[PDB]
Design an enzyme around this catalytic site. Structure first.
Site, PDB file in Angstrom:
ATOM      1  N   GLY A  64      33.825 -61.600  38.866  1.00  0.00           N
ATOM      2  CA  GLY A  64      32.996 -60.407  38.836  1.00  0.00           C
ATOM      3  C   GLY A  64      32.551 -59.953  37.460  1.00  0.00           C
ATOM      4  O   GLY A  64      31.649 -59.118  37.375  1.00  0.00           O
ATOM      5  N   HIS A  88      28.901 -55.930  19.343  1.00  0.00           N
ATOM      6  CA  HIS A  88      29.641 -54.661  19.509  1.00  0.00           C
ATOM      7  C   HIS A  88      31.017 -54.625  18.874  1.00  0.00           C
ATOM      8  O   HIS A  88      31.595 -53.528  18.727  1.00  0.00           O
ATOM      9  CB  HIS A  88      29.810 -54.301  20.979  1.00  0.00           C
ATOM     10  N   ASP A 119      18.541 -57.397  21.738  1.00  0.00           N
ATOM     11  CA  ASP A 119      19.373 -57.235  22.935  1.00  0.00           C
ATOM     12  C   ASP A 119      19.003 -55.806  23.503  1.00  0.00           C
ATOM     13  O   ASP A 119      18.588 -54.919  22.724  1.00  0.00           O
ATOM     14  CB  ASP A 119      20.822 -57.189  22.446  1.00  0.00           C
ATOM     15  N   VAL A 142      22.092 -54.714   3.362  1.00  0.00           N
ATOM     16  CA  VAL A 142      21.752 -55.159   4.702  1.00  0.00           C
ATOM     17  C   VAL A 142      20.904 -54.069   5.334  1.00  0.00           C
ATOM     18  O   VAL A 142      21.285 -52.891   5.263  1.00  0.00           O
ATOM     19  CB  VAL A 142      23.003 -55.435   5.579  1.00  0.00           C
ATOM     20  N   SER A 154      17.381 -52.202  15.203  1.00  0.00           N
ATOM     21  CA  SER A 154      17.727 -52.405  16.594  1.00  0.00           C
ATOM     22  C   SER A 154      16.721 -51.765  17.527  1.00  0.00           C
ATOM     23  O   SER A 154      16.382 -50.588  17.365  1.00  0.00           O
ATOM     24  CB  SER A 154      19.109 -51.815  16.862  1.00  0.00           C
ATOM     25  N   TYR A 156      18.386 -47.442   5.496  1.00  0.00           N
ATOM     26  CA  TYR A 156      18.594 -48.882   5.699  1.00  0.00           C
ATOM     27  C   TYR A 156      19.072 -49.238   7.122  1.00  0.00           C
ATOM     28  O   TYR A 156      19.453 -50.384   7.377  1.00  0.00           O
ATOM     29  CB  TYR A 156      19.512 -49.455   4.624  1.00  0.00           C
TER      30      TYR A 156
END
Ligand SMILES: CCN1CCC2(CC1)C[C@@H]2C(=O)N[C@@H](CCCCCC(O)(O)CC)c1ncc(-c2ccc3c(=O)n(CC)ccc3c2)[nH]1
Ligand SMILES: [Ca+2]
Ligand SMILES: [Ca+2]
Ligand SMILES: [Zn+2]
EC number: 3.5.1.98
Length: 368
Positions: free
Chosen positions: A21, A135, A170, A187, A191, A216
């Protein structure tokens, strides 16, 4: 022009099982590999088997206690670790399964090996479909992720690159990666994700970074039903502005396929072509690029998506008619590579898309 592509894959990855599942199915990585082998995409790529990343490599980011726990826990000794399991968020989303540590070592090994290959200038693009587990936190598992292979790969890239751009397509906000680099300007994290009554609950467009990292971190919050037209309309202009202002010397692109139409956990409406247009857009800047996997829970569409994105990386045209393969029956009733969008309503009006893009552009004007 055409680029050298190095691809990372371990034939054992598809055998790791999260449990009955559980939506996360490592078998989708094996389906992707088998489909791209049957399309002949092996004739143009260097294929490498990643090493099993050591606890020491993982502790370049994660805590010693957390990595020691992951290396020790097993379904047969779980009763003795009830305290550490709660502390490290090991439970229903992130269960203990046979070979858990080895799965983390292979996922991480591919991403880090790809970054090393890019650092040595031995490839233009490195692909690790088993990575992209965005994550995972320094001392905590989260959202099916245990070891943050992305943060580890970026740390490797930072040895030779002053500025690294991370782009995450994603459907879920790339919180672990954003948090790891939230206070640094070395960096930039970008997202695009569904925001509102949706895991992990972070990624508001007002989360822009802190201290030296202010401006950033970029977040584009979206509603259900975004389509190729709408996504394409904001992706290229945002990435172009980020490239212009930030001038990164390397890029990491998380290609989570749960943003496709028909995903078991996602509620977006992109086709494989719409999703792959992001890869085409990033590739056009001609920078060292590490392409990673991530989410994707309707496994026949994940295999189609990542096979097509590998073809995009190689600048190889592949037919819509699927070649015969070990999982041919999973691709019925049509047996085609490309997918059709559903009739779901796109809650992201054209005005909402432009307004969010304009607010992001204001933040990007604040960069030096
Ligand atoms: C127990 C579920 N419950 C959900 C609510 C709950 C607490 C746990 C709050 C947290 C939450 O919403 N978790 C999110 C995490 C999404 C990570 C995306 C990861 C990436 O795609 O971004 C990158 C790899 C999430 N959405 C759906 C599931 C989901 C659904 C079904 C099942 C299931 O049937 N089983 C079989 C026992 C096991 C697990 C499970 C998990 N979990
Ligand atoms: Ca995202
Ligand atoms: Ca940052
Ligand atoms: Zn996801």
């Amino acid at each position: 022009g055409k680029k050298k592509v190095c691809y990372y894959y371990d034939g054992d990855i598809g055998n790791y099982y999260y449990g009955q599942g559980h939506p996360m199915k490592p078998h989708r990585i094996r389906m992707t590999h088998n489909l791209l082998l049957n399309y002949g995409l092996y004739r143009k790529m260097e294929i490498y088997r990643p090493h099993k990343a050591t606890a020491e490599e993982m502790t370049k980011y994660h805590s010693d206690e957390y990595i020691k726990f992951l290396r020790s826990i097993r379904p047969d000794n779980m009763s003795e670790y009830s305290k550490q399991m709660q502390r490290f968020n090991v439970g229903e989303d992130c269960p203990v399964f046979d070979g858990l540590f080895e799965f983390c070592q292979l996922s991480t090994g591919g991403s880090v090996a790809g970054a090393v290959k890019l650092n040595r200038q031995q490839t233009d693009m490195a692909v690790n479909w088993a990575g992209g587990l965005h994550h995972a936190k320094k001392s905590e598992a989260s959202g099916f992720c245990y070891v943050n292979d992305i943060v580890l790969a970026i740390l490797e890239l930072l040895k030779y690159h002053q500025r690294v751009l991370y782009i995450d397509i994603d459907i879920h906000h790339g919180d672990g990666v954003e948090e790891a680099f939230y206070t640094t300007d070395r960096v930039m994290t970008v997202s695009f994700h569904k925001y509102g009554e949706y895991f992990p609950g972070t990624g508001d467009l007002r989360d822009i970074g802190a201290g030296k990292g202010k401006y950033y971190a970029v977040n584009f919050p979206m509603r259900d039903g975004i389509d190729d037209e709408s996504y394409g309309q904001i992706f290229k202009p945002i990435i172009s502005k980020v490239m212009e202002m930030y001038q990164p010397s390397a890029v990491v692109l998380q290609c989570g396929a749960d943003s496709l139409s028909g995903d078991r956990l996602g509620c977006f409406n992109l086709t494989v072509k719409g999703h792959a247009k992001c890869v085409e857009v990033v590739k056009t800047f001609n920078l060292p690029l590490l392409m990673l996997g991530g989410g994707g829970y309707t496994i026949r569409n994940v295999a189609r998506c990542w096979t097509y994105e590998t073809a995009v990386a190689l600048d190889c045209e592949i037919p819509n008619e699927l070649p015969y393969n070990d999982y041919f029956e999973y691709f019925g009733p049509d047996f085609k590579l490309h997918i059709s969008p559903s009739n779901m309503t796109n809650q992201n009006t054209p005005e909402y898309m432009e307004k969010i893009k304009q607010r992001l552009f204001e933040n990007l004007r604040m960069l030096p």
